[PDB]
Amino acid sequence: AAEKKERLTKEAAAVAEGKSKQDASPKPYAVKYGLNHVVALIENKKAKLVLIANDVDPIELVVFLPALCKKMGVPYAIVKGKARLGTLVNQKTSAVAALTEVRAEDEAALAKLVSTIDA
């Protein structure tokens, strides 16, 4: 798909950007965990942004995140490193999956970043 630059990947993992503000929103309020829960939020538009790891396995769990993000109209970003977005949510283990329903606090950098993607 689109290629992220390792600059955007900083700022918000949930947003097009890479994780940073994404740690915010857990401390502030709202997030998701894995693919399963994250998928639900898109379904019932709750998440502003959700992220996806680039690596992925052949998991193809994250296979229908796009198209089923772009219907709902939920912007979602690519991060590199499943671990990277795994760590921002408080998770010892990495997760290919996504997030931020509410985007507390960073209703700011988040959404600014979304603009960067799909500029």
Partner RNA sequence: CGAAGCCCUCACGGGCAAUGUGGUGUCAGGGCUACCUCUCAUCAGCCGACCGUCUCGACGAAGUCUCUUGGAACAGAGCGU
Binding footprint of RNA on the chain (CB under 7 A) = 33-38, 40, 55-57, 59, 61, 82, 86, 91-97
- Strand bridging mode 50-53 / 76-79: parallel
Q: Return the number of the residue (92 or 119) whose C-beta is nearest RNA.
A: 92
Q: Return the number of the residue (61 or 109) whose C-beta is nearest RNA.
A: 61
Q: Return the number of the residue (12 or 61) whose C-beta is nearest RNA.
A: 61
Query: By CB neighbour count within 10 A (0-12 exposed, 13-18 middle, 19+ buried), where does 103 fall?
Result: buried
| Shortest distance, position 98 Cβ to RNA, whole Å | 8
Residue type (1 letter), 50 = V
CA 88 to chain centre: 10
